[PDB]
Design a protein around this motif. Structure first.
Motif, short mmCIF file in Angstrom:
data_model
loop_
_atom_site.label_atom_id
_atom_site.label_comp_id
_atom_site.label_asym_id
_atom_site.label_seq_id
_atom_site.Cartn_x
_atom_site.Cartn_y
_atom_site.Cartn_z
N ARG A 67 0.84 -1.19 0.00
CA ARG A 67 0.00 0.00 0.00
C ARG A 67 0.88 1.25 0.00
N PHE A 68 1.73 1.37 1.01
CA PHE A 68 2.69 2.45 1.10
C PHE A 68 3.45 2.59 -0.21
N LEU A 69 3.90 1.46 -0.76
CA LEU A 69 4.59 1.49 -2.04
C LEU A 69 3.78 2.24 -3.07
N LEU A 70 2.49 1.97 -3.13
CA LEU A 70 1.64 2.66 -4.08
C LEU A 70 1.57 4.15 -3.77
N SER A 71 1.60 4.51 -2.49
CA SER A 71 1.53 5.92 -2.11
C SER A 71 2.69 6.69 -2.72
N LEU A 72 3.89 6.18 -2.47
CA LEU A 72 5.15 6.73 -2.97
C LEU A 72 5.00 8.03 -3.75
N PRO A 73 6.11 8.77 -3.91
CA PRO A 73 6.09 10.03 -4.65
C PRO A 73 5.44 9.90 -6.02
N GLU A 74 5.17 8.66 -6.43
CA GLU A 74 4.57 8.38 -7.74
C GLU A 74 5.59 8.74 -8.83
N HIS A 75 5.57 7.85 -9.82
CA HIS A 75 5.70 6.39 -9.57
C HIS A 75 4.18 5.99 -9.77
N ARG A 76 3.92 5.25 -10.85
CA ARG A 76 2.54 5.01 -11.33
C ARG A 76 2.69 4.37 -12.72
N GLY A 77 2.24 3.12 -12.78
CA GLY A 77 2.75 2.13 -11.82
C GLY A 77 1.48 2.07 -10.93
N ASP A 78 0.98 0.86 -11.07
CA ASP A 78 0.46 0.37 -12.37
C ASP A 78 1.68 -0.49 -12.79
N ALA A 79 2.04 -1.43 -11.93
CA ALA A 79 3.17 -2.36 -12.14
C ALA A 79 2.89 -3.63 -11.33
N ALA A 80 3.89 -4.23 -10.68
CA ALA A 80 3.63 -5.32 -9.74
C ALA A 80 2.74 -4.85 -8.58
N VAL A 81 3.21 -3.88 -7.83
CA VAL A 81 2.53 -3.45 -6.62
C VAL A 81 1.00 -3.49 -6.64
N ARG A 82 0.42 -2.50 -7.32
CA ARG A 82 -1.01 -2.21 -7.17
C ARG A 82 -1.83 -3.48 -7.37
N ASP A 83 -1.60 -4.14 -8.49
CA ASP A 83 -2.36 -5.34 -8.79
C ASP A 83 -2.04 -6.47 -7.82
N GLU A 84 -0.86 -6.45 -7.21
CA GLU A 84 -0.56 -7.34 -6.09
C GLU A 84 -1.54 -7.08 -4.96
N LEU A 85 -1.69 -5.80 -4.61
CA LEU A 85 -2.65 -5.40 -3.59
C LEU A 85 -4.03 -5.93 -3.94
#
Lengths: 102, 52, 151, 175, 421, 129, 376, 35, 59
Positions: free
Chosen positions: G10-28
């Motif tokens: 979740r925090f990873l998705l928050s990041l300065p962006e970065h978007r993405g829309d990569a592994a992370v989000r869809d992992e969540l």
């Protein structure tokens, strides 16, 4: 009315003075005495008393000790008794007839 | 490695040694006391808001 | 107004009535302290006899066995019932009056004392793996039987 | 400053106020000066149009000087405050002097000319004599340096004790 | 309905400090108002006059109070027409009111009177009155009303531009005791402020600090937000950077951004960034008067520049300092640095012919004099905090008498028995 | 305690029966007393004497240290007793040693002892020269 | 559990962006599905600002209603056939289910009431552990400090050294979650001997943390003693290839490289959560140490020597030291005219004095503040 | 700086206790004034 | 007392930004503070430390 009141008050102003300055006196003579009553009671401690072991204390200023003579009483503890130092069963200084914890 | 407390001056090819022994204990305990107090204050105020 | 409002200026002086106010208490408090240590002769009055109540009765007087000596049936303090007085409990006996001075707190229990003397590990479940079927049985034979004897 | 639009116009304002502030600087009255700033607090006041002359003139001597001196040259777009200039000018130089006395003991004469903004070489030793500065062939000394003395012996124990005493009173009187 | 409280508030009409309590709920007694409910006072009561007044808008000790309710009614109703006119008629009556208790009640009155007001007739004509009875009440020795009124006219001087008039005003002022801590902080606030504008900082921090202490909290935000604005300014001018835990406390962190963009400018000691920021947030800083305070910092910023350039270099060619500070000329420099030295900042000397600053040491490591003073000052604080708490704490004090007569008799009896034995 | 009396706790022996009590006072002099005053006085060379410093430092380092361990005690008593009464209180504090009278009492030594030592020096330096 | 990883990603998705829309989000999202989560979906959507498929939400909420229904029903059957130790367990599955459903207040209350039961230790303690766990999950603080105190008592009474270790892993990780690295040093560093609490993260991650914080707040001879010579690290610190490379670079006086690995790992911290914005605090500090360690053996050395060593230009190096010198965090002082740097040693007193006064002031400000409150 | 200071804390704590006694006191008194 | 405070606040201002702030009205604090400052420096430095040294490679 003033010449009877506005003037009858000056007394009052002194009443607080008569007492305001005297009031400090009781505060002052008490403190010197305060050391007296504390020292004067020293006799309570005496010298030829009967050691006892501490048992339990009903609450403030009280407890049950053991007598080496086998008595076990509800006795009274001198204000001096630097309490903190009252584990669960102390060898204890006992007044004899006042029979209380020295 | 803090073994002998000195410093090398390579300019003159010299080695200085020192005799350290100042890390004062008093002042340390004083700082530690400030910590324990800084905990007691918070806990003291935790009762005030309740009594006020 | 001249002298009129004048009364006000001095009238407000009542402030000194309060401080002294703080004094009295502040002063009276010492008087108790200075006088409090005077009745210290009280310690001399006498002593107090703890006692072991055998049990209370009719006629008004608690039946008791003190300690070294033995049993005495003796009156209570006025400040307690006869009914509030149960069996097996400590109470201040007026020493020479041999009447209840007051009733001390706790008695210590005997069954608890026996249990203490036995000292049998206080064990909570979560610490015995490999003993359920039993436990179940146990629950069946004990827990359930008690929780809802209606079952 | 009175409620009106046709009343407060006269440009003799714009020049006159500035003249006044500058007066206050000339007399070294800083309190009155900043008080006046707070007064004039002209909200609808762009930068400071003419009024930056005295203001800016003040801010810079809150520190540096060269920028200030520059302001001295820029009043000639101005009025008789030139006299004030000759005031302020001297009022600055002593400062540098009073500065440099403690700064460092040693100056070449041309450098003193550089600092004090002289266009003359002799005006220098004029000033330095007026300052009592012993001058060695273009090179001045400002000695003594400092008397890093008072290693504490008068207000170290005579004040603290009372302090102590006080403190102890603060401890005693606490009753 | 709610008017019961207005009647219940009238049950506070007995005597003296009841009014105090009476005011408290009356602070929140203005939650509900109706014009028909106004007729309540019409039925509550001189009487005819009151009725007439009520009609126009749309026992005496509570007469003034109900007039308060009229003001509160109007002002809170937005309507200035009737509200304004009423004040003139209400303020006068309640003012000349030949009563002592009424002075306390009128303070809430005056608090509104000035408020709605706009200009001269209010700054000037209304100010002459506040000073008038200010003197009257001053001789009447009503602490609260005095302090309030004083605050109002001070606030007038500062809605004006006159700090001096207010300063010399203070010079002839004595403030009283028994106060309301809020008014107390209003004072300390204005005081600290004007005290600052006159350049004297080190005593301003004091009065503003008190304005932080003595101020209440609940939701009294904007006053804290504003003051802090002045707090940060003074702390900054005085040369002492405030800690971050300041620019981020509450909802106010959204207004302190400018000052949080000043310290970043100041600490770094980079002039151009500072100036640019001042242009950026200027207009924002004008909505209060902290502006002309802030524009003074140009001195402090440069002081910082010099002090940092000093701590981080033992000796520097003037060229380089002049580059780091962006300034035009070296000649400019040695004026600036020569200045910094006299002020006990750098502890250096200057090599002119080679033109490099060379810098003093910390031989002054353990001055001992410094820490002592700081220590001494602190101790006085703990003491006072211990003295005030001993004089205040020291105040259900009664029901005293140990010993006894009944028991004493019993004891005597016992003794007698013993004797007999 | 002193008693004087003549014939015809103590009542067991017939205080009033076989004998009877008297009263006592003390003939005095303004000097007598003056001698006795110096009884609990000090010496001469006293007042200017400065106890061993180094040794003193131990009191402040050792004394403060001992207090430190207490500081936490006071913390635990406030966070604990914070939710009780006085009868429950006697159970707690008749047992152990509350750290309250320790911090206040302990501060007493540091305060006055340090002030006397600080003050003594302040005088010796200025005075003795 | 609830599995932290959700939070980290979740925090990873928050990041300065970065978007993405990569592994992370869809992992969540993938772990929303299998987790039929909800309180996120609105919480997250309102946070990230990207909601859609009102249908999916309804499905998740539905199934949730199904099981909460079921556990409620199960509990109902117990009330008539208790089953003390049993009831509490069904509750543990209730609030636990709130954990899978990641609703804070609910599992909170549920657990609490289960304590009134619990009775044992693993339930009254370990359950607490989970309750705080939620704390770690949400990114709270106090909610934990008050419970680590609870468990603290429960452990102080009896228990064992098996729970105390996990405990120190939690407390430690927390300490890292703030600027408190010193407390995490000993705590975590001592957590290498035992680490059964894979609940949070794996072992090599943990390793990197304890080695990181160790390097940061340990002394040079105790760095060599407890970390460079870590029997449990050698086998692991060989498993890695970044922090270690830096740690060695320091200890052995191979600076210039140390820097590069330092920057690297920094660029690896901003990705984590335990540090979040601490990536700026860490490196700052790790700059000073080396500068410190480099000078300590010199009473004077020339810039170009330093710059040469680290492999940067002078001007930038000077610019760096200028940060740390005025703050008395570094005992150097510079002479730019000759490009030289001499080292002035500090006095012990000078250290404490500055610290003592700072601490004393903090206590004074707090004392007075609340003084006025209680005074009125 | 420690003694004086901490000592002040002790007074403060004591003050707090007093305010506790007062607050509780007026509650019970005002309570009784009912009947 | 609270009401009095509120009144005081009102007099001192209203206010514009203050109102907005109030409307906005959270979070924590962690432990200690100062000095934050800018960011993107370290790598920037390395980015330059390369470039620097790369420039010094260019040297």
């Amino acid at each position: 009315d003033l010449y009877s009141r506005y003037k009858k008050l000056q007394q009052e102003l002194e009443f607080l003075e008569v007492q305001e300055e005297y009031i400090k006196d009781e505060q002052k003579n008490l403190k010197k005495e305060f050391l007296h009553a504390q020292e004067e009671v020293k006799r309570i401690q005496s010298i030829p008393l009967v050691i006892g072991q501490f048992l339990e204390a009903v609450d403030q200023n009280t407890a049950i000790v053991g007598s080496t003579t086998g008595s076990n009483y509800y006795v009274r503890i001198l204000s001096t008794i630097d309490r903190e130092l009252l584990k669960p069963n102390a060898s204890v200084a006992l007044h004899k007839h006042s029979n209380a914890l020295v | 490695d803090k073994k002998f407390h000195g410093i090398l001056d390579q300019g003159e090819g010299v080695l200085i040694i020192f005799d350290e022994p100042p890390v004062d204990k008093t002042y340390e305990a004083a700082l530690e006391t400030i910590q324990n107090m800084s905990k007691v204050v918070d806990s003291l105020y935790n009762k005030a808001k309740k009594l006020t | 107004y001249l002298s009129k409002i004048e009364e006000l200026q001095l009238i407000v002086n009542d402030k000194s009535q309060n401080l002294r106010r703080l004094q009295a208490q502040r002063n009276e408090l010492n008087a108790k302290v200075r006088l409090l240590r005077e009745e210290l002769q009280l310690l001399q009055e006498q002593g107090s006899y703890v006692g072991e109540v055998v049990r209370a009765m009719d006629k008004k007087k608690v039946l008791v066995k003190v300690h070294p000596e033995g049993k005495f049936v003796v009156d209570v303090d006025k400040n307690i019932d006869i009914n509030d007085v149960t069996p097996n409990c400590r109470v201040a006996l007026r020493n020479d009056s041999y009447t209840l001075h007051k009733i001390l707190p706790n008695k210590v229990d005997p069954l608890v004392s026996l249990m203490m003397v036995e000292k049998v590990p206080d064990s909570t479940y979560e610490m015995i793996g490999g003993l359920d079927k039993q436990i179940k049985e146990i629950k069946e034979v004990i827990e359930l039987p008690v929780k809802h004897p209606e079952l | 400053f009175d409620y009106k639009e046709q009343l407060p116009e006269s440009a003799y304002m714009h020049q006159l106020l500035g003249l006044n502030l500058l007066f206050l600087l000339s007399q070294n009255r800083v309190a009155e000066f900043h008080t006046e700033l707070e007064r004039l607090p002209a909200k609808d006041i762009q930068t400071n149009v003419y009024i930056k002359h005295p203001v800016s003139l003040e801010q810079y001597l809150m520190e540096g000087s060269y920028n200030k001196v520059f302001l001295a040259k820029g009043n000639i777009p101005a009025e008789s405050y030139t006299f004030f200039i000759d005031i302020l000018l001297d009022t600055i130089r002593d400062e540098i002097a009073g500065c440099i006395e403690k700064a460092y003991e040693k100056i070449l004469f041309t450098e003193a000319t550089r600092i004090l903004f002289f266009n003359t070489p002799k005006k220098m030793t004029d000033y330095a004599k007026k300052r009592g500065w012993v001058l060695g062939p273009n090179n001045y000394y400002s000695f003594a340096s400092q008397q890093q003395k008072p290693e504490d012996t008068t207000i170290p124990s005579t004040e603290l004790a009372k302090q102590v005493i006080e403190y102890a009173r603060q401890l005693e009187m606490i009753v | 309905a709610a008017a019961a409280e207005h009647s219940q508030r009238e049950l506070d009409t007995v005597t003296l400090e009841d009014i105090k309590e009476h005011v408290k709920q009356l602070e929140k007694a203005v939650s509900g108002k109706e014009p028909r409910f106004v007729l309540r006072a019409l039925r509550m009561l001189t009487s005819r006059r009151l009725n007439h007044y009520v009609l126009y808008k749309a026992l005496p000790e509570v007469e003034a109070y109900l007039q308060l309710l009229v003001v509160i009614f109007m002002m809170n109703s937005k309507r200035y027409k009737e509200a304004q006119k009423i004040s003139d008629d209400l303020m006068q009556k309640i003012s000349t009111q030949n009563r002592r208790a009424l002075d306390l009640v009128a303070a809430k009155c005056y608090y509104y009177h000035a408020r709605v007001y706009e200009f001269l007739d209010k700054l000037d004509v209304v100010r002459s009155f506040l000073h008038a009875r200010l003197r009257t009440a001053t001789l009447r020795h009503d602490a609260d009303g005095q302090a309030t009124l004083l605050n109002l006219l001070l606030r007038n001087y500062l809605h004006y531009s006159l700090y001096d008039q207010a300063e010399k005003l203070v010079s002839k002022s004595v403030f009283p005791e028994q106060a309301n801590n809020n008014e107390w902080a209003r004072y300390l606030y204005y005081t600290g402020r004007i005290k600052a504008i006159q350049l004297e900082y080190s005593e301003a921090r004091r009065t503003m600090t008190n304005a932080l202490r003595k101020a209440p909290q609940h939701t009294a935000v904007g006053f804290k937000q504003t003051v802090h604005k002045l707090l940060i300014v003074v702390e900054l001018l005085l040369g002492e950077i405030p800690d971050r835990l300041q620019f981020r406390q509450p909802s106010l962190k959204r207004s302190l951004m400018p000052y949080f963009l000043l310290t970043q400018a100041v600490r770094t000691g980079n002039l151009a960034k500072f100036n640019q920021v001042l242009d950026q947030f200027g207009e924002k800083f004008q909505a209060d008067g902290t502006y002309t305070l802030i524009i003074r910092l140009r001195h402090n910023v440069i002081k910082t520049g010099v002090r940092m350039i000093s701590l981080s270099y033992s000796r520097i060619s003037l060229a380089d300092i002049a580059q780091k500070l962006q300034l035009d000329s070296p000649e400019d420099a040695e004026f600036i640095v020569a200045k910094a030295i006299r002020d006990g900042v750098i502890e250096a000397s200057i090599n002119h012919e080679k033109g490099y600053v060379q810098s003093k040491e910390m031989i002054d490591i353990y001055s001992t004099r410094e820490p002592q003073l700081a220590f001494h000052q602190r101790i006085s604080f703990c003491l006072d905090i211990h003295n005030m708490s001993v004089k205040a704490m020291r105040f259900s004090y009664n029901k005293d008498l140990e010993s006894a007569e009944e028991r004493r008799e019993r004891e005597q009896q016992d003794l007698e028995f013993a004797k007999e034995m | 305690v002193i008693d004087a009396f003549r014939l015809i706790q103590a009542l067991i022996h017939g205080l009033n029966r076989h004998y009877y009590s008297i009263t006592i006072n003390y003939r005095k002099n303004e000097l007598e007393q003056k001698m006795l005053l110096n009884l609990h006085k000090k010496s001469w060379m006293e007042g200017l004497t400065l106890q061993d410093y180094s040794e003193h430092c131990k009191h402040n380092e050792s004394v403060v240290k001992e207090m430190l361990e207490l500081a936490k005690n006071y913390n635990k008593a406030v966070e604990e007793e914070d939710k009780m009464t006085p009868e429950q209180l006697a159970i707690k504090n008749v047992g152990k040693q509350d750290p309250k009278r320790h911090l206040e009492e302990h501060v007493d030594v540091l305060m006055t002892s340090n002030i006397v030592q600080c003050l003594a020096a302040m005088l010796d330096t200025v005075v003795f020269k | 559990n609830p599995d932290l990883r959700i939070a980290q990603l979740r925090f990873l998705l928050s990041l300065p962006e970065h978007r993405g829309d990569a592994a992370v989000r869809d992992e969540l999202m993938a772990a929303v599905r299998d987790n039929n989560m909800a309180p996120y979906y609105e919480a997250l959507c309102k946070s990230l600002d990207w909601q859609i498929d009102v249908d999916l939400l309804n499905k998740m909420k539905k199934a949730n209603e199904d099981e909460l229904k079921r556990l409620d029903e199960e509990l109902e059957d117990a009330e008539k056939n208790l089953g003390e130790s049993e009831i509490r367990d069904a509750m543990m599955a209730k609030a636990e289910y709130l954990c899978r459903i990641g609703d804070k207040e609910g599992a909170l209350t549920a657990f609490r009431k289960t304590y009134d039961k619990t009775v044992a230790l693993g339930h009254r303690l370990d359950i607490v552990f989970y309750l705080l766990r939620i704390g770690l999950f949400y990114m709270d603080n106090d909610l934990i400090t008050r419970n680590t105190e609870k468990a603290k008592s429960l452990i102080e009474e009896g228990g064992d050294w098996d729970r105390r270790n996990r405990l120190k892993v939690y407390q430690g990780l927390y300490c890292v979650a703030i600027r408190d690295f010193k407390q995490a040093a000993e705590l975590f560093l001592d957590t290498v001997s035992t680490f059964t609490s894979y609940e949070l993260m794996d072992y090599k991650t943990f390793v990197t943390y304890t080695v990181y914080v160790s390097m940061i707040a340990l002394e040079r001879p105790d760095l060599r003693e407890k970390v460079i010579k870590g029997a449990e690290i050698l086998e692991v610190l060989h498993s890695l290839p970044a922090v270690r490379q830096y740690l060695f670079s320091l200890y052995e006086c191979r600076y210039s490289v140390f820097f590069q690995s330092l920057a690297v790992v920094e660029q690896e911290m901003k990705k984590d959560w335990l540090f979040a914005p601490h990536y700026r605090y860490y490196v700052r500090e790790m700059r000073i140490h080396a500068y410190s360690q480099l000078l300590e053996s010199y009473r004077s050395l020339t810039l170009g020597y330093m710059a040469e060593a680290f492999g940067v230009g002078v001007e930038f190096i000077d610019q760096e030291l200028s940060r740390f010198i005025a703050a008395g965090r570094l005992h150097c002082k510079i002479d730019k005219v000759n490009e030289i740097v001499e080292t002035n040693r500090p006095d012990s007193k000078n250290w404490q004095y500055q610290e003592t006064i700072k601490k004393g002031d903090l206590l004074l400000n707090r004392v007075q503040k609340l003084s006025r409150v209680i005074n009125m | 700086y420690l003694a004086s200071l901490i000592r002040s804390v002790v007074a403060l704590h004591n003050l707090i206790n007093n305010k506790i006694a007062n607050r509780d006191a007026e509650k019970k008194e005002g309570q009784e004034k009912e009947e | 007392e609270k009401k009095q405070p509120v009144d005081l606040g009102l007099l001192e201002e209203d206010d514009e930004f203050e109102e907005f702030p109030a409307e906005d009205w959270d979070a924590h604090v962690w432990e200690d503070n100062w000095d934050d400052d800018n960011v993107e420096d370290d790598f920037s430095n390395q980015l330059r430390a390369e470039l620097e040294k790369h420039g010094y490679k260019m040297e």
